[PDB]
Amino acid sequence: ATAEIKPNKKILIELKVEKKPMGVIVCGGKNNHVTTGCVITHVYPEGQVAADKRLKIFDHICDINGTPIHVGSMTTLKVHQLFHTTYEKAVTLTVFRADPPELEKFNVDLMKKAKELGLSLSPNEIGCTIADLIQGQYPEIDSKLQRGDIITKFNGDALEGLPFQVCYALFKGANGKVSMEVTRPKPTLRTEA
Amino acid sequence: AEPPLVFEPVTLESLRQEAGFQAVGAAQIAELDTLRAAHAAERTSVQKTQNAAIDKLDIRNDANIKNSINDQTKQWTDMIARHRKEEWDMLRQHVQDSQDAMKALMLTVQAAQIKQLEDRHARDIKDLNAKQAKMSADTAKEVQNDKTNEKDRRLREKRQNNVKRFMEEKKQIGVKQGRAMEKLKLAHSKQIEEFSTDVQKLMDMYKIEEEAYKTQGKTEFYA
Numbered sequence: 001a002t003a004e005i006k007p008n009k010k011i012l013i014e015l016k017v018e019k020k021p022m023g024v025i026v027c028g029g030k031n032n033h034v035t036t037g038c039v040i041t042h043v044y045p046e047g048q049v050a051a052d053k054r055l056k057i058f059d060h061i062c063d064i065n066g067t068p069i070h071v072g073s074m075t076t077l078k079v080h081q082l083f084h085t086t087y088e089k090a091v092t093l094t095v096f097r098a099d100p101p102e103l104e105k106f107n108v109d110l111m112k113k114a115k116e117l118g119l120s121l122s123p124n125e126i127g128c129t130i131a132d133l134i135q136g137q138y139p140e141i142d143s144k145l146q147r148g149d150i151i152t153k154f155n156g157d158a159l160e161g162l163p164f165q166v167c168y169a170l171f172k173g174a175n176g177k178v179s180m181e182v183t184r185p186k187p188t189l190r191t192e193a
Numbered sequence: 194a195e196p197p198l199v200f201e202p203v204t205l206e207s208l209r210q211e212a213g214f215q216a217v218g219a220a221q222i223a224e225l226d227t228l229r230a231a232h233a234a235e236r237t238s239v240q241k242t243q244n245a246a247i248d249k250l251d252i253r254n255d256a257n258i259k260n261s262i263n264d265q266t267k268q269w270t271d272m273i274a275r276h277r278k279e280e281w282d283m284l285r286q287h288v289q290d291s292q293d294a295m296k297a298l299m300l301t302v303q304a305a306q307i308k309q310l311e312d313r314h315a316r317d318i319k320d321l322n323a324k325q326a327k328m329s330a331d332t333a334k335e336v337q338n339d340k341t342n343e344k345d346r347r348l349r350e351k352r353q354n355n356v357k358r359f360m361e362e363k364k365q366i367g368v369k370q371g372r373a374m375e376k377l378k379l380a381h382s383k384q385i386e387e388f389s390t391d392v393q394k395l396m397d398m399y400k401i402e403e404e405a406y407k408t409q410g411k412t413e414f415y416a
Contacts, residue, residue, distance in 0.1 A: 021405035046408035081394055084401045116240045117416040122409075129414050164414070165262055166254045171416040172247045 001090065005054055007099040010062065010190075015052045017087040023047015024063070024083050025122070025129050027148030028069070030074030032146070037062065038069040038079055039185035041120055042129035045189040057126050057150075058101035060187045067185060070191045079160070088092060104186040105152075110140045112174040121171065125161040126151035127183065128171075130178035143183070153181035198313050200306045200377065203384045204390055213292075213298055221287045228283060232276045239269060240415070270410035277406065281399045288392060303381040310377055314370045321366060325359050360367050363392060 003016035019054045023044030026032040043050045061069050064082050071079055118134035118141065127150040135142055152159055156179065159167055201207065208214055243265050250258045332355065336348040 021401055022410060023405055044405070044409050044412060047405065081398045084398045084405070085394060086397050086401060114244070116244065119416045120413045121416055122413045131409075161341060163329070164256070164266070165259050166264055168414045169247070169254065170243065171414070174244075188408075 001097075005095055005097060006095075006096040007101075010061075010094050011036075011095050012094050013052075013054065014090040014092055015048070016055070016090045017048050019047045020051075021046075022049045022083050024049045025148050026079060026083050027146065028071035028079040029074055030072055032071065032076040032079070033146055033189075034185055035071055035190045036081075037187040038071055039187055041150050042124050044114075044122070056097070057124060058068065058103060058185055060096040060098075060102075061093055061188065062096055063092070063189050065091045065093075068191045070160050070193050071130070073193045081091070086185065089139075096187075098187075102185065102187045103183055103184050105181070108140070108144055108180045108182055110138065111180050112176060112178050114174065117171070117174070119157065120168065121151065123159065123162055123164055123178060124150065124169050126150055127159045128154075128167055128182060130148070150183045151180045152183055153179070155179060194313070197373070200309070200380070202380070203302050203306075203388075205295075206207075207386055208298055210294055211298055211302065213301075214295070217291055217294065217328045221291070224283060224287075225280075228279065232280070235272070235276070236415075239272060243269065267411075269415060270413065271409060274406060281403060285396060285399065288396070292392070294384075295388075299385065303384070304380075306377065307374075309398065314373070317366065317370070321362060325362070326400055328355065328359075333361065335365075 003011045003013055005011040005013060018113075023043075023046060024040050026038055027041055028038035029035075038060065040055055040057055040059050042057065047057050063069055065087065067082070069079065069082065080154060115137055118137045119130050120132040121128040122131045129150045130145060130147050133141060133145055133147055139189035154170055155169055155173070155177075158181075209218055245263070247262065250256070250261075329352075332348065332351050336344070336351070341347070
């Protein structure tokens with residue numbers, strides 16, 4: 001059932017859920033920026049995924065309860081719904097972590113006005129993963145950022161494994177130019193419709 | 194047409210865009226935008242106050258301002274829980290009101306496809322009959338060409354041999370048409386299945402989004 005999940009190898013795990021929220025932010029979908037698979041970008045501590053203590057960030061979920069996770073034939077809402085559905089027992093997943101983990105690193109910039117930013121951030125060990133993005137304000141993020149896109153820098157300040165209070169403060173500062181370094185997963189495709 | 198009809202599948206997304214659902218879906222969408230207008234004003238108001246107070250209080254980040262900013266990161270998340278509960282409440286309500294009517298539209302749209310195919314099948318039969326009528330004419334005209342009342346035995350025998358060819362063609366095309374009909378109808382049965390389950394998954398997802406948020410919004414702040 002439960003395995004070791006060594007990187008760069010597909011390991012089939014059996015994770016006990018029992019109607020409990022998994023608490024993960026995933027990216028995937030045909031209408032999504034991540035079109036090459038489903039990848040965890042954030043794990044919440046109160047959820048069952050952190051309760052499993054086996055899934056770090058940038059792990060490609062290829063299968064989920066005997067269901068191959070192909071992002072090409074599913075909308076982003078359908079992939080997100082997989083992780084936000086009730087499950088009675090241990091869920092069977094095929095997970096593919098890598099060393100080095102496959103990822104593309106790009107950058108973003110803009111100027112701020114006062115109009116808030118419209119991003120709900122959840123600090124991670126990697127950065128600050130976007131949990132909710134408001135459309136209709138500051139259109140640049142609308143065409144570049146998404147729920148699941150992790151922010152690793154702000155005003156030149158890295159957000160790697162930082163306390164909650166510090167990230168809140170420096171994001172609250174605004175008042176001018178802005179610059180964020182982002183990381184999006186571009187994994188090797190590993191399924192078929 | 195020349196190729197067989199290919200029907201677009203009847204999904205939940207396709208129904209929203211149908212003509213009958215419009216009088217209902219517009220009113221539902223209208224309710225959401227007003228309530229979202231109510232929500233949008235309130236976060237704007239809460240953002241003004243929070244962003245106006247945080248300007249007061251440096252890079253020490255060890256002071257007694259930690260309980261103050263997580264006071265903000267507490268009250269704002271409590272408000273957002275209230276917002277999203279109001280939203281999910283309305284969405285589920287919209288599903289209950291429209292639920293029976295949407296089942297009805299899918300049945301009616303699918304019925305339309307059945308009639309479309311039925312008509313297509315009717316034209317195919319008329320086409321076969323035309324081909325066969327010309328066949329009968331070609332056999333009579335050819336009997337007038339050759340010679341051997343003394344030669345009428347071969348034409349009647351050709352007629353006995355064509356009715357058999359005709360009766361078989363009608364038999365086999367009906368078989369093909371009936372399979373097309375059965376396949377189409379099965380498509381519809383699966384559509385009704387995936388419609389019902391997608392709605393069930395939606396509601397469940399709301400339940401689990403709602404539940405997970407209580408221990409998650411504490412780990413989130415708004416920028």
